[PDB]
Nucleic acid binder design. Sequence first.
DNA 1: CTAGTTGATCTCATATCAGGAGAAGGAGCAGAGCG
DNA 2: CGCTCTGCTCCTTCTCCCATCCTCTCGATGGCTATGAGATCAACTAG
Lengths: 51, 520
Amino acid sequence: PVPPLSVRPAVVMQGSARNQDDLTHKLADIVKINNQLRRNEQNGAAAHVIA
Amino acid sequence: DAEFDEGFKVPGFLFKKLFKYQQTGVRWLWELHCQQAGGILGDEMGLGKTIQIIAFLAGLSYSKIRRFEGLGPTVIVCPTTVMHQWVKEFHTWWPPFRVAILHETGSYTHKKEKLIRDVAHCHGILITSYSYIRLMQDDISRYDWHYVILDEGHKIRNPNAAVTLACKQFRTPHRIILSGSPMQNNLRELWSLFDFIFPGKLGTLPVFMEQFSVPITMGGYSNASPVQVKTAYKCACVLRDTINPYLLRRMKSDVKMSLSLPDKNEQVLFCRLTDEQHKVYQNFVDSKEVYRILNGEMQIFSGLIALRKICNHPDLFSGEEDQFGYWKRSGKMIVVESLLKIWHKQGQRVLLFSQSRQMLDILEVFLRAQKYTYLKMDGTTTIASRQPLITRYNEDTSIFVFLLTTRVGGLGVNLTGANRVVIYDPDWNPSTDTQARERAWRIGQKKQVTVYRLLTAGTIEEKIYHRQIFKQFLTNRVLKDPKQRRFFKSNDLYELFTLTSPDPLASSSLLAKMRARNHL
DNA sequence: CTAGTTGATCTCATATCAGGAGAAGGAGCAGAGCG
DNA sequence: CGCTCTGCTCCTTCTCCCATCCTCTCGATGGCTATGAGATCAACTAG
Ligand SMILES: Nc1ncnc2c1ncn2[C@@H]1O[C@H](COP(=O)(O)OP(=O)(O)O)[C@@H](O)[C@H]1O
Ligand code: BEF
Ligand SMILES: [Mg+2]
């Protein structure tokens, strides 16, 4: 379960740079590796790579 | 009439019109029908695959073979520029067919779902586009079509594109692909095509990749050790054997003598960057953005596109007679201007290709700066006018140059009225340019053709040329012979941001084949 | 009605040290029945 | 008479917790993740 935006608000700094929450960065890592694992299982990858 | 093995007759007049290899192809299509398999008409561009398909379908309707009595409702999926080319060829070759178009242009003027329904219930040929197959799979697959010919079927080459998943939803066994280049970047594309015509032959993409793609590829890198070369040769032989029954790929060298085609040249000009073009390129390779690319911080695509623009023309920094896209600022346009001058005085018609729409606009402004009469067809020109445009160019010779993007101006269109063709800018994909150059040297070309490929020497373009030579060698390893010379001209690494301006078998044939294969 | 142009939208394709305290598991083992 | 089934102890992890409220300054944070061709389509902008 990925929480809503209220639990991880993207606070705007003095300028326009929108800083993301720690939860959002972590979910970014999770989605990155999840997509990476999904393609590695779908396409050519070694068993140790998938592991 | 000509009669084949079981009950398949093709009319004598329709058959007499064909060539020897085209009737070999009609035969091959019908053995595919008999075995209820699909296949790839891989005859390279211009040999006539529309005619083999139409002749086979006509003989399928005319033979009244036995669910469907004769020919059922078939769908032909093709690039948008050739839907009306297909309709024209059907109406001249086999007029009894009802050939609808499923497109905005179309001819229907009612709900499209109604058109699909009617063609399913009167056994017509529904000619649609890949976009429509993606968009209307809800309706296109509720009707049990009899054939699913995909023209330029290499649009199915990505196993994960939505078009690919859509086209693989037809329940029918009689899947056909027309593509004179059914392998463009790697073997995954071949797997996708064969997974459409016959899902199981090549295995799941897991097995295909591990068994074929990694071996066959790793034996083409320059540094490949001999053992790994021999493994690649063995695996290529196995793959060719496996796909032999379902690929029919004739070239214009086994047919050309039997086809009365004129001579062909394929020169590659190495243009020179101008001093200002060189200065922009040097200041971009020295720019910090390239440094960020080489460190993995930023995406390579941005820098690649910037360099391609620089070699095309310095439209990055737009420098009277200094308007945007002035021809004298780019070396390739200097070469093109000289070539157009000579060819115009030689009374000849040219086919000018470009990967980029912006560069095509620059070349249009350049041609109008000259007095040359031209004609332009990119992805923005309305589809309904594209076949008229082609017809215009082919019919009246006052029009001198035909400005084309390789993506719409390549890919199945017949432009034999053209005589000279210059590929202004290379593409990463070799086959884009193969098909663009084959737009001229086709059945119907009565004059000698020469193709000019413009590369800026020592620039990104030469590297793209090396990439596509490597890809073409990997393709030739598994289409024409498994004994391909290793690509040694480079290691094809991420230093393409550097400017380097120049200056019953009886168990013994079987066992012998096994000892052969294993000894390798 | 008829084309044609123009945005928007979406698909696709290009590359390589000055804690503590308790609770839980595990292991060594002494020993009791007892098969 | 050799195996099992305890169940006691010593050690080892292992994990949790460590007053309340309040004021101020100071340094870092950047995160940036493209591009374009083609097709589709729906709305004007003319006819
Ligand atoms: N046997 C033939 N007789 C007459 N014309 C032919 C024959 N075969 C092909 N053609 C013509 O050659 C042209 C090119 O063939 P086409 O089917 O467009 O090539 P591809 O195989 O690349 O699709 C077509 O316009 C077609 O009319
Ligand atoms: F493959 Be094309 F039809 F020449
Ligand atoms: Mg064709």
